Design a protein around this ligand. Structure first.
Ligand SMILES: Cc1c(C(=O)C2=C(O)CCCC2=O)ccc2c1c(=O)n(CCCCc1ccccc1)c(=O)n2C
Ligand SMILES: Cc1c(C(=O)C2=C(O)CCCC2=O)ccc2c1c(=O)n(CCCCc1ccccc1)c(=O)n2C
Ligand SMILES: [Co+2]
Ligand SMILES: [Co+2]
Lengths: 381, 381
């Protein structure tokens, strides 16, 4: 059931912004590890005396990495005279965010029809304002409201190239890396209490609950009208046998924040081959692979979707597989992206639900919690 | 002239420590960009609840990357009960250092015969103490004094594997990258006034001035007894035609700090080939190459040291060449390592002064300031 109750017109995920200590080093690491190309910049070389911001792209996926310069460079500026390209940026907020949470997502940005309207409607419906609508070069409007913890939901709308004030990157500095990642599928928050988090976000967006089907969590998913913007939220389940990874997150993150970004690949086999080649030479590591029993058990569960060779390819790469009543999900998880056991990345590809492919086809892999557990125990004996 | 006036016994450069916001991402970037392998770690997985520290090595070169965790993880600790492996570390100092200066060198560490004695003698001779001598597992002693700005000179001495509390890194996580870098040749500070900086450092070390032979700088070099520890210091020259890069450094760094690290390569051609292959895929960029006139002029200046083919190889890679009365220097400079136009890296190789090779053979390339200028002007016409 999809009541299509969005209170404003939402299009697609637009970009994800990381707040960093040094944007250069994070962006270069992510570019190599994920196969994303350097696409735009806003920094000292473009006249920005406030923050350094670097944009990586792969297909429609946009990762933005931002860090503050010394406030002394912009001491004489005021907001009306700012050289910042992102008017919501604040030195003190950025440093406090990073000192509190470490490296992580500050902004989940969605493209909307009218960011000014989306902001007004959201706040009228309970959203806590974070940054009011600002029109950039009469061309792009940006606004922000609080999502959870210190993460904001950023609205962007275009009259009609990332943002005014950003420059396209020189061809020589823009190596065309591509491991097959194409868009952001979903962005997941960890909170202490799921109930109030859902009520708050669903309250100001009109996003509806997306239908699902001792893991340490309870979860629910909020979706836009066409279910292409997908925002799952988790809370811990306490007293468990093994300590909840949601609770570990909240402790090391100093509270609620973004837990994982799921990146859709047009060819998850090639993406995982390319990322795993680079794990130990600057890229990303992956969670330990499931035992062979997990892949033996794949034949009975998805043998009508994947050949034995394609299942064997899943086993080589450590890929997990889950299935809905509608579609099939191939997924895998990186180890944490930085120092803290907080944010990580999921790579996914979805099979089925053709009409284009409908959003969330195959679910989010929650069935893999028990299938992993079963496969571990079976492999022991 | 070398009066050999060290006030304590100094051996070699031991390691350089960067203070980071996220040590994981900087270390992974540097590892790929410079060809250094992951060698040791001290972090949550080793019981360190205070800081994450990752050690890269290439030959004898040791780069340490450290960032603080949330203070909440270690809230119940006191110094006598600390889980930090580096007892001088302080959350507040680290965050203040990084917020003030951005990514950069906190510690220039030299191995000494007795770090306790070196510290006492240094402070008795005017050194400003930063962290007193601490004995780690009855095996290693570490002490720190102020060098310039917020950079410390760290003394380390061993009774007899990096530091107690560090673990050797798993073979699978330790890819054996190597582009030929072998040791730290010199570490350079930028200060507002060279005179007092030299008097202070030479005062507490007994290091002597190393003999040299409109660039924006005045410079001098302090050296240990065998001239293997080399600490150049620069100050700006104001009112210049082009603005002094030393002054730009001080403005963007918020004052004095480490300007560049010079890394000796056993094969600068191979190092530069490997680093340049990786510049646009996560590694380091290099300064713009000199015009062909610079390499035409090489034949008259070093044609007795390098063949035409080796000079042509310098031209392919953008390598600079300078010469002493004793030796020849091959050198090249990276663009800044992070967001701010502050710290950068120099790759060098020295030809001559065989006895082993004596320290500083060929100088530091100051002759390349005028040779660059001349070659630029000549190439214009
Ligand atoms: C996150 C995840 C998902 C997932 O995507 C997701 C949603 O999108 C929304 C619904 C709730 C939810 O869970 C599905 C299955 C997972 C996992 C997962 O995380 N794990 C491993 C634990 C430890 C990994 C880890 C890696 C790095 C750092 C910390 C923890 C699994 O085993 N399954 C099987
Ligand atoms: C540093 C450097 C050295 C050098 O090593 C050095 C010493 O060891 C001690 C003595 C003083 C000194 O100078 C020698 C020659 C250099 C340079 C140098 O820097 N430049 C370029 C300017 C701009 C580069 C830059 C790169 C990245 C960011 C900011 C500035 C040169 O042209 N020559 C020719
Ligand atoms: Co997911
Ligand atoms: Co130098």
């Amino acid at each position: 059931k999809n009541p299509k109750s969005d209170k404003f017109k939402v299009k697609r995920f637009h970009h994800i912004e990381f707040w960093c200590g040094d944007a250069t080093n994070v962006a270069r690491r992510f570019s190599w590890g994920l196969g994303m190309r350097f696409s735009a910049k806003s920094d000292l070389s473009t006249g920005n005396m406030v923050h350094a911001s670097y944009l990586l792209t792969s297909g429609d996926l946009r990762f933005l990495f931002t860090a503050p310069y010394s406030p002394s460079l912009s001491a004489g500026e005021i907001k009306p005279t700012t050289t910042a390209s992102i008017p919501s940026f604040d030195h003190g907020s950025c440093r406090s965010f990073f000192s509190s949470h470490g490296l992580g997502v500050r902004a989940v940005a969605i493209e909307v029809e009218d960011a000014e309207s989306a902001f007004s409607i959201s706040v009228a419906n309970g959203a806590i304002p974070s940054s009011p609508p600002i029109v950039l070069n009469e061309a792009v409007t940006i606004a922000e409201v609080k999502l959870y913890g210190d993460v904001v939901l950023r609205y962007v709308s275009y009259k009609a190239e990332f943002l005014p004030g950003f420059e396209r990157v020189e061809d020589a500095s823009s190596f065309p890396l591509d491991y097959g990642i194409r868009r952001l599928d979903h962005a997941v928050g960890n909170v202490p209490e799921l109930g109030p988090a859902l009520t708050y976000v669903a309250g100001f967006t009109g996003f509806h609950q997306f239908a699902e089907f001792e893991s340490g969590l309870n979860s629910a998913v909020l979706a836009s009208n066409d279910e292409m913007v997908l925002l799952p939220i988790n809370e811990p389940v306490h007293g468990t046998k093994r300590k909840s990874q949601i609770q570990t997150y909240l402790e090391h993150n100093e509270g609620a924040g973004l837990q994982h970004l799921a990146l859709m690949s047009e060819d998850i086999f090639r993406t995982l081959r390319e990322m795993r080649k680079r794990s130990s030479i600057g890229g990303f590591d992956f969670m330990p692979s499931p035992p062979p029993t997990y892949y033996q058990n794949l034949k009975k569960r998805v043998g009508d979707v994947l050949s034995d060779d394609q299942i064997k390819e899943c086993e080589e790469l450590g890929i997990l597989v889950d299935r809905d009543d509608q579609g099939t999900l191939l997924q895998i998880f990186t180890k944490p992206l930085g120092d803290r056991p907080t944010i990580f990345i999921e790579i996914i590809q979805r099979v089925g639900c053709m009409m284009y492919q409908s959003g969330g086809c195959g679910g989010f892999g929650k069935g893999n919690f028990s299938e992993l557990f079963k496969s571990i125990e079976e492999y022991e004996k």
